[PDB]
Every structure is written in C-alpha cells, then in structure tokens.
Design a protein around this ligand. Structure first.
Ligand SMILES: *[C@@H]1O[C@H](CO)[C@@H](O[C@@H]2O[C@H](CO)[C@@H](O)[C@H](O)[C@H]2NC(C)=O)[C@H](O)[C@H]1NC(C)=O
Ligand SMILES: *[C@@H]1O[C@H](CO)[C@@H](O[C@@H]2O[C@H](CO)[C@@H](O)[C@H](O)[C@H]2NC(C)=O)[C@H](O)[C@H]1NC(C)=O
Ligand SMILES: *[C@@H]1O[C@H](CO)[C@@H](O[C@@H]2O[C@H](CO)[C@@H](O)[C@H](O)[C@H]2NC(C)=O)[C@H](O)[C@H]1NC(C)=O
Ligand SMILES: *[C@@H]1O[C@H](CO)[C@@H](O[C@@H]2O[C@H](CO)[C@@H](O)[C@H](O)[C@H]2NC(C)=O)[C@H](O)[C@H]1NC(C)=O
Ligand SMILES: *[C@@H]1O[C@H](CO)[C@@H](O[C@@H]2O[C@H](CO)[C@@H](O)[C@H](O)[C@H]2NC(C)=O)[C@H](O)[C@H]1NC(C)=O
Ligand SMILES: *[C@@H]1O[C@H](CO)[C@@H](O[C@@H]2O[C@H](CO)[C@@H](O)[C@H](O)[C@H]2NC(C)=O)[C@H](O)[C@H]1NC(C)=O
Ligand SMILES: *[C@@H]1O[C@H](CO[C@H]2O[C@@H](C)[C@@H](O)[C@@H](O)[C@@H]2O)[C@@H](O)[C@H](O)[C@H]1NC(C)=O
Ligand SMILES: *[C@@H]1O[C@H](CO[C@H]2O[C@@H](C)[C@@H](O)[C@@H](O)[C@@H]2O)[C@@H](O)[C@H](O)[C@H]1NC(C)=O
Ligand SMILES: *C(=N)[C@@H]1CCCN1C(=O)CN[C@@]12C[C@@H]3C[C@@H](C[C@@](O)(C3)C1)C2
Ligand SMILES: *C(=N)[C@@H]1CCCN1C(=O)CN[C@@]12C[C@@H]3C[C@@H](C[C@@](O)(C3)C1)C2
Ligand SMILES: *[C@@H]1O[C@H](CO)[C@@H](O)[C@H](O)[C@H]1NC(C)=O
Ligand SMILES: *[C@@H]1O[C@H](CO)[C@@H](O)[C@H](O)[C@H]1NC(C)=O
Ligand SMILES: *[C@@H]1O[C@H](CO)[C@@H](O)[C@H](O)[C@H]1NC(C)=O
Ligand SMILES: *[C@@H]1O[C@H](CO)[C@@H](O)[C@H](O)[C@H]1NC(C)=O
Ligand SMILES: *[C@@H]1O[C@H](CO)[C@@H](O)[C@H](O)[C@H]1NC(C)=O
Lengths: 729, 729
C-alpha cells in the first residue's frame, strides 16, 4: 500500500470535510436550507425548492451577519450580528428585524445593542428579549417595547436568562424564558446570585492592553452558597391595555422550600397549564407541579393531586437532571423517561392527577429520548437494537396498542448506519433521519404517513471518493466481561492492523458519570491521525459510572467519584495487554476535563501500567468544581455528609506517584469552567515533592482551547509529546 | 581523574558553602559578630572578644527569633519574629525589646504586631516604627509611643515607608525614614498612590483555599499615573502626650514642582542641615537642596544659592539614580560621584555655597563608591587597577594633595584577590576588607593610621581543602574589540579544558543598563555545574549599555532598549562560534528578567547563531514594566516622545523568527515585579504564528522563584532542556 495516510495537517486543516444537511422546519410541509449562502425553502413532499432569501440582499448591510431566524408566521426575519461569545451557550449580539413583506429593514424601536437573548413567540411575530438582565416584550417589530422586570442587575439579578451554573449544569442554555403555546403567556425564571462567591481570574487581551483585566463571575463551588430562583408568568396579551402588567409568581412546593433547591424543568402543557420540576440541593428528590390559570383571580394554582414525585434510592434523579414531560394535546396525560424497577430508563405514561404511571417500554436497554408525539404514535430513540448500548435507532410505538413497536431506522442500512438522530416537521408529518456512523454520515427525508423514504438529502459520496486514496484506520466496537457484566470498548486501529504485532496504545478517557466513549459514531479526529499515520491504537472504555446501560452501572460511582471509574480504566488497559497485540511498554492515557481528572488519577495510582499521559483542563479537587454538577454525585463536602471522600479523591494527594510516569499538563488561563486554579494546584503539588513534568498554558483560552491557532498548537504540542513517549531506542 | 565533578545536587543542596564574616561596627573600636548563635563583641586592635548575649538567654521565648538589632548604646536588643515577606525589601514582623541592664523583656507599650518598619535612632535608644502606614516614636523602650502621622491608609497613603515602585526602583528599601545624626530630628517621606492603577493577579494559596484570591498592588506601568511625594521633618525632642506632633514640610524646588518628579536621595549633613535630591520624571535633570534648621522660625530653609543642578545630555542621571553626597564634619562641603566631561564617573568636591565642583579623580575608569571620609583622606572603591572594569579595589586619596593616591587592596594578594568591598569602623579607624575573587573569599581586618594588616578573619581554608577533591571549572576573563572599543567577556571553562576539542556553549545573559556580567568574582552557581559535569562552556559578555566603563558605552542604549545590547550579544556569540574550541552547532542562550528579555529578542532576531534558549520572567513589552525603571531609559510612551520605539522593541513582534529555535519560557504566577502578563503575551504571540515551544509556570512563585522546592524544580527542568538541546545526533 502506497496511499497517503491521514496526517496531523489533514486533521488541523480540515482537508477531509464532513458534509452536513442542516435544515430548519418552518411548517409541517416546508424547511429552510442554506445553498451557496442563499436561503432556499424546500417542499418536503416533492423536493422542489425556491429562493427564500437571495445571497445578495444584505451586501448593503454594513455588518457581517452571524445568523438569522424567521418569525413563525413567515412575516419577519431576525438578523443577528456583532456576535460575542460568552460561556458554553451564552453570547451577546445586535439585531435588526427585516420585514419580508415590505422587503425593508425596520429602523424604528430597534432591539438594543448588547442584547443577551431574543426569541420569537411560537406563533405570529411577538418578540421577547433580555437586555441589561431585564425582560422586554415587543408585540410588533416596529413598535415600542414593554418592560417586564426592573430588578435586573449585572452579576446579581438575572431575569429570563441563566447565571453561570444554571446555564452550564441545569438548562444547557442561556435563556430562562418560555412562551405559552399560542404566545399569550410569557413564563420566566429569575436568578438571585447576591451571596454567590466570585471566581476571579486574569484576562490579558490584545498585547495593546497595559493592565490585565480581572474577570469576576458568580460561580458556586461545591458546598458554597447557591443562587436562589423564583418563577413568574406574565400575560403578554394584557400589555398594551395595562400600564404595568403583573408577573404572577408560582412558588415552589413546601417539600422544596425547606432547603436549598433548583428549578430544573419548565414545560407548557396547554394554553393555560404549565408544568414545573424542582430539584432539592440533595439531588435524589424532585417534584413536578402542574399549574392551571385561574381566570377569575388571575392566579396560577398547582393542585397537590397533580403533583408528581421522582426520587432515587441508589443515586441522583435523571441522567443529568429529571427528564421533560411530553403532554398529549389535551394536557391531561404525559409521557416521561424514568428509571424503572430494574434500573433501566423507560417511557412511563401518567395521568396528571394519578400518582402511579404505566411503563410502555421495558427491557435491558434504554430509551434515550422521546422525539415526537401524535394522537396515534409516540416516536423515540433507544439503544435496543442488537443489545448495543452505543447504537441509536428511531422507534414508533402505537398508543392504542403498546405491543406494536416498529423500528423505523434499524434496517435502512445496517452496515453503514447504527447511530441515528431525527428531526420532525412541525406536526410530525415528515422526518429527517441523520445517520452518523459507523460509516459516513447519511441524511435522509421520510414521510410519516407511510414511513417511506422520500429521498437521500446528503450521502457524502464526495468525501467517500477522497477517502479511497487514503490509508484510513478502522474502528472495532466490542465488549469484555468483568464480574458477569458486559463492559464496552472501542479501538481506533491502524490501517493493515496485524494481530501478530505489538502496538503502542493510547487510552482516550473521559469516564464521567453517564458518559459513553464506546459507540458507533464515525469521527475524523486526532485519534484518526494517531492510528493512521503513527500506527497507535487509540482505545476508550466504558466502565462503572458510564451511561445508557442501567443504574446498576451508572450509580456504582454514587458519592464515590475518583474510584471505580478510575480503576476500571486501569483494568481496561490490563485487559488490552492480555489481548496480545499491545506493546505493554508503550501504554499512554489522556483526556480532557473529566478525562483530565481521570488521566491524572490513573497516572498517580502507582499501577505501573502507563508510561505517560496528558491531562487537559483537568479537575484536580472536587471542592474547586461547581456545586450543581459536583454535589449531584458527591453530595455536600461537610463532616456530616461526604467531606472525607471529597478530601480523599484529589489528584494532589497522589503527587509522589508521578515520579513513575511522564506527565503533560495543559490548561487555558481563561477557563471559566474548570478553573486554571485546578492545574495550578496540581503543578504546585508536583513541584513540592520534586517531580519533573511538562506543562503548557494557553493565554486567554477557555475550556475549549478552541480558537483556530490554539487548537492547532495544542494538538501539535500533544503529538510531539506522544511521539517522544513512544519512539524506540 | 577519579575526583567527583561539581554536580546539580551540589549546587541545589549547597554541599560546598562559602564562609562569611559579617560583622557590625558599634563604635570606632569594636564590632559585633554572631558566632554559634551567641553575639560576641570584638576589640578590633587586639582581636579579643567577650560575650554580649548568650545563645540561650531566649530559650523560653516561645517564638523563633528571625533577627536582632542592638540599640547603638548597647542597652537594648530588638527581637524580630513572625517575619512575613512582602516585596524585595518589605516585610512585616512582630517585635519585642529586651533590656540588657534589667536582664528582662519589656512587657508594656510593646511594639504592635504587623509592624512594617522599625529602626533605632543612630545614637542612644529612641525608636521609630511604622504600623498601618503611620509613623510612631518611642523615646524609651518601655514608654508610650507618640503618634507622628494620622493619614496612613493601606495602598493609598504611605508615611515613612515606600510604595511598590519607590521600594524597588528608587530607595532599594522599604523604609522612608531618616534620623538626624544625633536623633533630634526624624525626617520622612510620604507617598500618595491614590490614582496609581493597580496590577491584579491570582494567588492560589494552599490546596484548602476554595476560591483563589486576587492580589491588588498600586503599580505604575510605563506612562501611567505615578505616586506623588512629600517630605517632612519632626523634632522628636519636643513631643507631647497632650498635643499632636508638628511635622515641618520641606517642599520640592519650583523646577521640580512644574511636573511629575521623584524624591531620590535624603542625606543628613549635620545636626541641623539636611540635603535632598529630586529627580524629574524625565530622568535627565535632578536638583539637590540643602536645608538648614532655623531656630527662631522652627522652620527649614533651603537657600537657592545652595542648590546644585545635575543633568545629562546623553542619558539619565547617575547609574540607577543620582549618587549620594558625602559631607565633611562641618557640613560646609561634600564629595559626590558624578559623570565627568569625558563621561567617566569620578569624585567631585563641592562647596555648599558654590556652583562649580572640582574633580579630585580622573581617568578612563570609574569610581564605584565613596566608602569613608576623614579630614585627611577620602576612601573609595574603583576599577582602576590594571585597567580591568570588572575588578574592584580600595583606594585612599589625600585631600590636601590629589596627586597622592594609594591603593590599599591591589597588592595584598593579586592572584587570589582582584575584587574587594570594604566596611569601615565609626570614625574610619579600622576597616574590614572582603575579597570575593577570583579566588576563594578572604576577610581581613586593617587599621587606617598606617594601613596595617591586623589579622585574617576568615580565609575559607576548609572549603579550599574540600574543593581540591572536586573537578572545578576555571574562569577566563578577557576582551574582544568592536569598532575600536574593548568589550569584556568571561567564560566558565570545564575542568581539563582542551583548546583542540569543540565544546557546546551557553550564553548567560543579563545585559540590562549599567550591568556587569564579566567580572573577577568567584561563584558557585548553575554555571559551575554546567561546566564541571556537563562540559558546557558558560560565557557572559558586557556589550553596549553595560556599566563601569563610561557613559559612551553605558548611554549607547539611551531611548533604545532592545537594540545595541541585543545585537552585541549576538555578535559576541558569533565571535565565540569562530573560536576553535566552540561547537557552532550547539550555542544556547539564557537569562532572567532583563536577561529573559534579551534572550527572547536574540532568539527572535533571525540571526541563526543560537539553537535554543531559556527565558525566565522576561520583560516582553516595555509598556508592561514599571514607570521609574522603564522611563529612565526609554522616556515616555507617547507619540510626541518615544512611543514608536516602545512598539518596535517588543518580543511579540518577532514571534515568526522563533520558528527555527527551541525555546523554554518560564515565569512565576505571583511575580509582582515582571508580571506573568509579560510571558502570557509571548506565549499567545507564539501560538498565533504556529510556533511550538516549551513552557513552565510556577504557581504562587514571585520573581525570585526562590522557595526551596521551586528553586530545585526550575533548575532541574532547565538542566533537562539544555542537556536535550546539546545531545548529539
Ligand atoms: C412595575 O411594577 C413593579 C412591581 O411593583 C415595580 O417594581 C417595584 O418598584 C418599587 C419602587 O421603584 C420597588 O421598591 C420594588 O421593589 C419593585 N418591585 C419589583 C418586584 O421589582 C415597577 O417599578 C413598575 N414599573 C413601572 C414603570 O411603574
Ligand atoms: C391563546 O390561549 C389563550 C389562553 O387560553 C386565549 O385567551 C383566552 O381566550 C378565551 C377566548 O376563547 C377568553 O375567554 C379568555 O378571556 C382568554 N384568556 C386570557 C388569559 O387571555 C387566547 O385567545 C388564545 N389565542 C389565540 C390567538 O387563539
Ligand atoms: C438522598 O441522599 C441522602 C444521602 O445519600 C440520603 O440521606 C441518608 O439517608 C440514610 C437513611 O435515612 C441515613 O442513614 C443517612 O444518614 C443519610 N445521609 C445523609 C443525610 O447525608 C437520603 O435518604 C436520600 N434520599 C433517598 C430517597 O434515598
Ligand atoms: C492624595 O492625592 C489625592 C489626589 O491624587 C488627593 O485628593 C484630592 O484632594 C483635593 C483636596 O482635598 C480634592 O479637591 C480632589 O478632588 C482630590 N482628588 C482626588 C482624585 O481624589 C488627596 O487629598 C491626597 N491625600 C493626601 C493625604 O495628601
Ligand atoms: C543634637 O543636636 C541638636 C540640634 O543641634 C541639639 O539640640 C540643640 O542644642 C542646643 C545647645 O544646647 C540648644 O540651645 C538648641 O535649642 C537645641 N536645638 C533643638 C532644635 O532642639 C541637641 O543638644 C543634640 N543632642 C545631643 C544628645 O547631643
Ligand atoms: C532630557 O531628555 C529629553 C528627551 O530626549 C530632551 O528633550 C529633547 O530636547 C531636544 C533639544 O532641546 C528636542 O529637540 C527634543 O524634541 C526633545 N525630546 C523630547 C522627547 O521632548 C531634553 O532636552 C533632555 N534634557 C537635557 C538636559 O538634555
Ligand atoms: C413546489 O411545487 C408545487 C407545485 O405542485 C405540484 O408539483 C409538481 C412537481 C407535481 O408533483 C404536482 O403533483 C404538484 O401538485 C408548488 O405549489 C409549490 O409552491 C412549490 N414549492 C416550492 C418551494 O417551490
Ligand atoms: C580586650 O583587651 C583589653 C585587655 O588589655 C590588653 O592590653 C593589650 C595592650 C595587650 O597587652 C593584651 O594582651 C591585653 O589583653 C580589654 O580592656 C578589653 O575589654 C578586652 N575585651 C573585649 C573588648 O572584649
Ligand atoms: C469537564 N468535563 C468538567 C469537569 C467535570 C464536569 N465537567 C463539566 O463541564 C460539566 N458540564 C457538562 C455536563 C454535561 C456533559 C458535558 C457537556 C454539558 O453541556 C452537559 C455540560 C459537561
Ligand atoms: C528584571 N531584571 C526586571 C525587569 C527589568 C528591570 N528589572 C528589575 O527588577 C528592576 N529593578 C532592579 C534595578 C536594579 C538592578 C536589579 C536589582 C535592583 O535592586 C536594582 C532592582 C533590578
Ligand atoms: C450567490 O448565488 C449564486 C448562485 O445562484 C452563486 O453563484 C454565488 O456563488 C453566490 N454568492 C455567494 C457570495 O455565496
Ligand atoms: C449600536 O452601535 C452603533 C455604535 O457603535 C450605533 O451606531 C448603532 O446605531 C447602535 N444600534 C442600536 C440599535 O442602538
Ligand atoms: C436577592 O437576595 C438578597 C438576599 O440574598 C436580597 O436582599 C435581595 O432583595 C434579593 N433581590 C431580589 C429578590 O430582587
Ligand atoms: C501579638 O499577637 C499575640 C497573639 O495573638 C497577642 O497575644 C499579642 O498581644 C500581640 N502583641 C501586641 C503588642 O499587641
Ligand atoms: C490629632 O489628629 C487626629 C486626626 O486629625 C485627631 O483625630 C485626634 O483627635 C488629634 N488629637 C489631638 C490630641 O489633637
């Protein structure tokens, strides 16, 4: 073989690009799609298109447009520019509204600069936005806004947006507002961070800045004072008729008010029914309220007969949080993924005023998500097919007969496609399937009326062609047996892999709770280069604490982070040695964030198994990490709760054992998530016991170390280190 | 040769220790010396001693005594403990006073904890101290203190202590107090930092600290708002318990008040006469006032006819600041080192009443310091002998005939001793000579009347005998010629140096203005190990900008930092590389602080001479560094002054050129002097152009990276780097 390999530059420079097919449904029949910077509108049924917006219409704009969004009634388009990243989901931007009917920009009563969030109402063209931490509503794009809150205060009161920890760990979003289905009501959360301590770090900025700035962010570490939260609902239809519309508060249940708690889910059921889930700071107890608008008092009432309790005896509640309900049209019943009696997550069906639900799925596998619900059918994704926890398929269950379950995706192309996600049109008339492995991504459009394939949207044949000329690595997905339990693993194997030979191995680790690093997804990444060009086997292993396989496995690390998930990685490497194709003198380990923690814990174990390793942005001590995430698994760091284990599971206390390995420690200085502090303490502890190691900081890079130049620099730096670790004398 | 070499462990663990002999003169006849933790008093003429304080008198004190300070009359001893370092000179401590007559500790009116500075009067046993930024005076150790100032405010108003930049760059001390010769008056400065911006950086502290703290320090970077200063004198003989002490202000001259200025020298002339020097922010103009106490006014008058102006047309004034005056017994005249018309630093004799001074020394060499003055002789150290700029000897000059100059140290032991410093008794009746190279240090006692060598105090006999069993490197001091000028260099040469072998070479650079790295001093440092064990030649070179050779050389870099002194290093290495015993494929460079800057500029020069280098806490951009030092050499970074060269002289601009070298960049995160910022911006510029390099941060280390564990760690890491750089294919 004399084909070129997949090299480091190929990865860093994106030589071989995955084609996507990102569409946005605007109705039950139509979707939008970007073709050569034009925006086309497509008829789902026939596949014909038209130009919705010519690529030329905003040359005279004066600003580089970042993104757009169309009002649901098709009458307006929201143009977003001056985009400035904040945290994982948050950012600020400017906005203009373009009137698609007058084919003109709106120049009156403009959305202000430095707007934090904006969203159309779900019907029509109402807008709600957050600016300087307060909520505003526009009934009409050209008309003046109604202010909803006056309490907004930078770093202190957040109305309709999350603070740092709620954004990262609770809502996976910045926005904390929720329009009712037809846009009458605007629900929102308000966060009070008054007593939450600040993380403080330097940001150096462009070379031209003389004095570095100090970034200060309300951020509760483990056991510290959390933000408090309140929930309100305003009737936006009353705005133009009243001076100052009343925000009606819906208070948390008594069982929550006794202590620290979180708002963890908001979901509208009908025009006049909203559901809330609350979670105790000790995250093994949650309560759902279901609240009705009382038309004669203007108030919101949550009948205790409608309150649902979700708890856990073995761990926390939910995968990362209690799951969302999906309500039937009339809002009198709902479906919800919950852990069954055997510890497997399955769909349960509830009447809103009956406490016991009925399971509609069951088995030793898990429902990943409920994707759509019609009067006749519920569609969901599971890992049922072939008992593969790392696969994903779309299924359709008949609501009038639960024994009738069709797999909609399983056999479409079983060799090429074992990992699916889906996108339904507005009333589930059509669906896009997105296959993402083990072969090249494949996007297809389907019609729900008959589940017939309409057309291939994108098959990546261009890439496939290019990839023929390349000595691509292969992926093996399998399992090994420990104490009568299956534990899955994957291996990125060099091309022409020969079992008779001994190979350097890199163990690519994450291993946080409910993580899954062994799966059927096709990836073009650093591992691809290492296996293809450097002939390294890159392995990953889902041990105790890993997800999608039941609570027996997932909750094994409950209150005990830094134990089983760490030792199971070490054991994995041992088992790979036994397999006979691994050079046991050349075993390396690496990971990012939770993977950095695990890597460091493994390198400090004294096991003798690993020659070297790389921790990027590691956690080093659970008390440095945020409350919501950490406490979920570890409880509170107090003598009466779990302090002993918090203190026993630090990287620093293993500093002496790093004498036996080669270590590379890397961290962005402006990491708002895993604070530079965490590596600063590892390095100090290593210096303190006389251990030599390698280090790299990335000035002004955050958790992602994702700026174009830093991304290339870090993977270059890590490649040299691995190659040095591995090469033969 | 079966002998051990001088290893890295020997340097790090201090296996071979230089013996010292640190005495304190208490009179014209006697000195104190700490021996076996006992304090002894020595008669200088005979050599006999008595015990002044037994090593056990404080056995039940309950604290470790950091240090001691005996009152000038011998009646009291100030005990220092709870020492907590601040910057280069500043610290706080607790103090107790022990009465030597009563043989007991004083327990009433104790000096407060967290005392910032304390000092005895020059005669007797009065005390002045600073606490919470205010000045206090005790007439007697057991009596209540009088409060002198009431304006002290942390980080804002400093009475009798310096702020950050005055401590580091002006006085090389924390104290800003000056007793009159007999203790009647206490002079002091007051610093006001209200509008000085703060440098801010993280401090991580011990592992147990959950949130890092932010350290905030008033620190003016180049061009920023400086502290303002006032000067005051208070009579300590007329203090009352009833009324608030009165301080008399001496205002700066009009020529200073017109703009930003500094107080740069305070020197008492008589019991009732004080001199002060002031320096313009543009540091090429200074003025001395000489101020007489007026008994009927109770005021201090500085006659214009007694002003002395000192300026420079080619650079700044003085080496690092205008030199100190040395007044005669009547205070009517004084001696002062100033740059002569040839640009060489020599002793000028001034009358307080007359504008023209008279040079009493001349020649192409320089006076280092005036050391002692009698009515018959002035004693000084110069580098006159053998025309060697890097040697130092003690001379006396006859005041009645300037042609009569006698060298007192030159011929004592020319082979071992070419570098001296001196300590004189109270009326210069006796002097101690401290030889520090080229051989092992040698301390001798002498009497002034006929310059008799009385006795050897310490000859390092023991060390000599240990060193005979080690393969020690030698030192070559020599010169090269550039455009007709001698420039000196030194080489630390491996044992058994062979002019026919080719050795790798490390350029140890500092090269700041007025620096000297080529000298006759004996040193046991990192270079010693590199030469003795690794057989690396370690060279240093004094090019343009270097000190003690006249202003033509020293002022060459005026307004032009990062030019000629960087060029001259490259040129020296170029010349070394053409010598027969230097391997031109293995030339490295390293330096700390100003040396880190120069090392970085050299590596980024594109010269191709250097294979690798190490920068420790480098400056990278002159606008990041402090006003007093930077502006001395650079002027102001404004478009109408010197901004273009501030911007042309950054390390960052040369990032591209690092592509062809190996670079290790190291910095302490708690460096208050050269901020971590400076390295953060270097790394970021290197990342931006795709250059790989090596880095190490030291968590919570300041500029010295001097904690015992960090110090071992940095040198271990640098040793690995140099060894790898010099390892042969
Ligand atoms: C709209 O109503 C709210 C609620 O009463 C007003 O906000 C209050 O204003 C007073 C006085 O300014 C404060 O003391 C209260 O704490 C505020 N309450 C809340 C819940 O924020 C608001 O000012 C009204 N807006 C207008 C324009 O009248
Ligand atoms: C959206 O839903 C809301 C809430 O049910 C509707 O508002 C109610 O409409 C009925 C008319 O059938 C009135 O009797 C009530 O007074 C309304 N209640 C409130 C709180 O406004 C609203 O009409 C619906 N909007 C649309 C466009 O259909
Ligand atoms: C939620 O988690 C906590 C901690 O695991 C549980 O509290 C423990 O409960 C048992 C049984 O009452 C006690 O013996 C322990 O002392 C408790 N530990 C504490 C308070 O730290 C709590 O019971 C859990 N809730 C559920 C439903 O399992
Ligand atoms: C220290 O300096 C500041 C100015 O840098 C002085 O504050 C000024 O004082 C005058 C008179 O009191 C006011 O009119 C100004 O408005 C003040 N300026 C600022 C910026 O605050 C302060 O008085 C000085 N302190 C001492 C003790 O001398
Ligand atoms: C220290 O010097 C001061 C200043 O000259 C002496 O104080 C003066 O002494 C004279 C002569 O006795 C008095 O008439 C003056 O009134 C004093 N001046 C002041 C300003 O107080 C003082 O005597 C000297 N101290 C010692 C211990 O000798
Ligand atoms: C102190 O230094 C400054 C800066 O070099 C000198 O000011 C310069 O003087 C010349 C001639 O008078 C002017 O043409 C320049 O424009 C000035 N430069 C600046 C930046 O102002 C000043 O003359 C020096 N003082 C002495 C005594 O030499
Ligand atoms: C797409 O075409 C629509 C025309 O309807 C006919 O399309 C023919 C191709 C054929 O299949 C007939 O059966 C259909 O009745 C038209 O109404 C839509 O406006 C077009 N949509 C877009 C986005 O261009
Ligand atoms: C130091 O010596 C003094 C003792 O007298 C000396 O006289 C010399 C002339 C010579 O003959 C010596 O042998 C004698 O010892 C005495 O006054 C000092 O107090 C002594 N001790 C000290 C200063 O600690
Ligand atoms: C690194 N992985 C850090 C340290 C341990 C927790 N981790 C987080 O960033 C936690 N936040 C999330 C939780 C889940 C899974 C990951 C993506 C996220 O969006 C959802 C946020 C990490
Ligand atoms: C490193 N050398 C830094 C950056 C450039 C100047 N430098 C300083 O620390 C300046 N301060 C002094 C100035 C002189 C020489 C050195 C010792 C000192 O006490 C007197 C303080 C450095
Ligand atoms: C605009 O659209 C046309 C296709 O109709 C295409 O040729 C052109 O490249 C597009 N321009 C940009 C800037 O995307
Ligand atoms: C936003 O910023 C610019 C000034 O930088 C201004 O001209 C523009 O009008 C602003 N937009 C709005 C909506 O205020
Ligand atoms: C936020 O909480 C603090 C107490 O922590 C309180 O004083 C303040 O009023 C609150 N602000 C609100 C709810 O707007
Ligand atoms: C210094 O600190 C100790 C211990 O807290 C205290 O008892 C003592 O009184 C302090 N000294 C003075 C002079 O205040
Ligand atoms: C001295 O001055 C200070 C501050 O101005 C004042 O508070 C104090 O009362 C004064 N004391 C006397 C005795 O005048």
């Amino acid at each position: 073989d004399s084909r070129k390999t997949y090299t480091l530059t190929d990865y860093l420079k994106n030589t071989y690009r995955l084609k996507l097919y990102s569409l946005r449904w605007i109705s039950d029949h139509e979707y939008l799609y970007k073709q050569e910077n034009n925006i086309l509108v497509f008829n789902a049924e026939y596949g014909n298109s038209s130009v919705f917006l010519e690529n030329s219409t905003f040359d005279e704009f004066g600003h580089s447009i970042n993104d757009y969004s169309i009002s649901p009634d098709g009458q307006f388009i929201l143009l977003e520019y001056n985009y400035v990243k904040q945290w994982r989901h948050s950012y600020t931007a400017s906005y203009d509204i373009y009137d698609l009917n007058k084919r003109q920009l709106i120049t009156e009563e403009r959305i202000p600069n430095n707007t934090q969030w904006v969203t159309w109402s779900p019907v029509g063209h109402k807008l709600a936005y957050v600016w300087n931490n307060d909520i505003y509503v526009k009934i009409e794009p050209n008309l003046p806004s109604y202010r909803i809150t006056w309490t907004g205060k930078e770093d202190i009161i957040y109305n309709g947006i999350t603070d740092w920890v709620y954004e990262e760990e609770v809502f996976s979003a910045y926005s904390a507002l929720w329009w009712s289905p037809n846009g009458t009501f605007l629900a929102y959360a308000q966060f009070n961070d008054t007593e939450v301590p600040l993380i403080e770090y330097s940001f150096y900025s462009d070379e031209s800045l003389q004095y570095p700035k100090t970034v200060r962010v309300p951020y509760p570490k483990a056991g510290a004072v959390n933000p408090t939260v309140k929930f309100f609902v305003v009737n936006t239809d009353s705005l133009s008729s009243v001076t100052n519309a009343t925000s009606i508060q819906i208070t948390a249940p008594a069982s929550m008010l006794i202590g620290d708690h979180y708002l963890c889910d908001v979901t509208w059921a009908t025009q006049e029914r909203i559901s809330l889930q609350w979670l105790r700071r000790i995250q093994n107890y949650s309560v759902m309220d279901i609240c009705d608008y009382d038309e004669s008092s203007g108030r919101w009432n949550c009948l205790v007969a409608r309150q649902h309790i979700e708890m856990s005896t073995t761990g926390w509640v939910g995968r990362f949080r209690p799951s969302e309900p999906h309500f039937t049209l009339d809002g009198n019943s709902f479906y919800k993924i919950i852990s069954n009696e055997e510890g497997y997550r399955h769909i349960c069906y509830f009447q809103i005023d009956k406490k016991d639900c009925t399971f509609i799925t069951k088995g030793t596998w898990e429902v990943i998500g409920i994707e759509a619900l019609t009067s006749d059918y519920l569609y969901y994704i599971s890992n049922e097919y072939k008992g593969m926890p790392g696969g994903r398929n779309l299924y359709k269950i008949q609501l009038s007969d639960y024994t009738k379950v069709t797999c909609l995706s399983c056999e479409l192309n079983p060799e090429r496609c074992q990992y699916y996600s889906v996108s339904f049109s507005k009333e589930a008339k059509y669906y896009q399937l997105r296959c993402s492995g083990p072969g090249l991504p494949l996007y297809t459009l389907h019609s729900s009326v008959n589940d017939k394939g309409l057309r291939v949207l994108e098959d990546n044949s261009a890439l496939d062609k290019m990839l023929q000329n390349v000595q691509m690595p292969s992926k093996k997905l399998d399992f090994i047996i420990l104490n009568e339990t299956k534990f899955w693993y994957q291996m990125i194997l060099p091309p022409h892999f020969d079992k008779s030979k001994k190979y350097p191995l890199l163990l690519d680790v994450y291993a946080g709770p409910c993580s899954q690093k062994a799966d059927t997804v096709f990836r073009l990444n650093w591992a691809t280069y290492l296996a293809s060009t450097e002939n390294i086997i890159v392995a990953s292993f889902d041990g105790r604490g890993s997800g999608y396989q039941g609570d027996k496995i997932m909750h094994a690390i409950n209150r005990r982070l830094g134990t089983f998930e760490v030792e199971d990685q070490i054991e994995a490497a041992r088992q790979f040695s036994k397999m006979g194709f691994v050079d046991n003198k050349r075993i390396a380990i690496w990971g990012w964030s939770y993977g950095g923690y695990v890597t460091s814990m493994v390198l400090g174990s004294g096991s003798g198994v690993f020659k070297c390793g790389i921790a990027v942005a590691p956690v080093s001590r659970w008390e440095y990490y945020d409350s919501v995430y950490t406490e979920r698994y570890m409880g509170l760091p107090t003598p009466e709760d779990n302090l002993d284990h918090y203190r026993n599971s630090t990287v620093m206390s293993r500093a002496e054992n790093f004498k036996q390995v080669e270590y590379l420690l890397i961290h962005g200085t402006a990491d708002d998530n895993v604070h530079f502090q965490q590596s600063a303490q590892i390095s100090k502890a290593l210096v303190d016991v006389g251990v030599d190691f390698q280090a790299m900081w990335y000035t002004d890079e955050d958790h992602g170390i994702a700026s174009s130049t830093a991304h290339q620099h870090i993977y270059t730096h890590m490649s040299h280190f691995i190659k040095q670790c591995f090469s033969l004398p």
